[PDB]
């Protein structure tokens, strides 16, 4: 239980400058102070260590958003979307290596692909519901179907925050991505040509 934390902390540290494939099971066992076979009391494989790390990061975001879902709407409509987008920016930005490794594994692991697909569907669904609620109150024009607008905005964030977190080029500079995304959500959700 205490050695299990050691294995996860070692994996997250090692993933910062090495992909999971360049990480052996012996690597994690040494990092945790245990023999290699003793690892398998805690985890069936290194893939399961990544899955546990990703599940905790994803659920950290999920609980931070749901905390905002249960509490009154902010007088300031720009700031309500900024606070939601910032959960993603801060949660995943605090676990870049796991975020990166998680994205790579979406191609190879049905568990990872399902975790990420399901999380994105959940928060796209929530975004569509807030937009539709904004229309019902007259705060937002009835332009595009809410769920399609919400999907594209959420897909932009996934791609743009990942590009920023991985240091890719092209990419928005890290200190600027929050303002950039918020501007595009707010104008596309509240404007009409």
Ligand X SMILES: CC(=O)NC[C@H]1CN(c2ccc(N3CCSCC3)c(F)c2)C(=O)O1
**Residues contributing to the site for ligand X (CB under 6 A):** 65, 68, 80-81, 84-85, 88, 92, 123, 126-127, 130, 154, 157-158, 161
DSSP string, 32-71: TTS-TGGGGGT-SSHHHHHHHHHHHHHHHHHHHHHHHHTS
- DSSP label at 78? H
List 22, 133, 155, 174, residue binding a second copy (CB under 8 A): 155
Alpha-carbon distance 84 to 137, whole Å?
20
**Window 121 to 140, contacts with a second copy (CB under 8 A):** 121, 124
Shortest reach from residue 66's CB to ligand X, in Å:
9
Stretch near a second copy under the rule CB under 8 A, chosen from 2-10, 26-34, 48-56, 158-166: 158-166
Contacts of 116 (CB under 8 A, 6+ apart): 58, 102, 106
Stretch near a second copy under the rule CB under 8 A, chosen from 22-30, 88-96, 130-138, 181-189: 181-189
Residue span 38-77 as binding mask against a second copy, x where in contact by CB under 8 A, dash where not: ----------------------------------------
Shortest reach from residue 170's CB to a second copy, in Å:
5
Contacts of 58 (CB under 8 A, 6+ apart): 115, 116, 119
Q: Which is nearer to a second copy, 60 or 143 (CB)?
A: 143
Note whether 121 and 135 are within 8 A (CB).
no
């Amino acid at each position: 239980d205490d050695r299990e934390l050691a294995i996860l902390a070692t994996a997250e540290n090692l993933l910062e400058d090495r992909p999971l494939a360049d990480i052996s099971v012996d690597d994690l066992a040494k990092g945790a102070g245990i023999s290699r076979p003793t690892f398998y009391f805690y985890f069936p494989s290194k893939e399961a260590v990544l899955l546990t790390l990703l599940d905790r990061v994803v659920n950290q975001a999920d609980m931070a958003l749901q905390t905002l879902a249960e509490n009154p709407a902010d007088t300031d409509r720009e700031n309500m979307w900024r606070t939601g987008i910032n959960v993603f920016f801060e949660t995943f930005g605090s676990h870049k290596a796991v975020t990166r490794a998680g994205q790579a594994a979406r191609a190879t692991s049905v568990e990872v692909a399902e975790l990420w697909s399901t999380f994105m569907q959940k928060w796209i669904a929530y975004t569509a519901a807030v937009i539709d609620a904004e229309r019902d109150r007259g705060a937002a024009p009835r332009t595009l179907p809410a769920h399609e607008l919400a999907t594209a905005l959420n897909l932009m964030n996934e791609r743009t925050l990942f590009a920023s977190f991985a240091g890719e080029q092209p990419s928005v500079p890290e200190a600027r991505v929050l303002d950039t995304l918020v501007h595009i959500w707010v104008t596309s959700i509240y404007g009409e040509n």
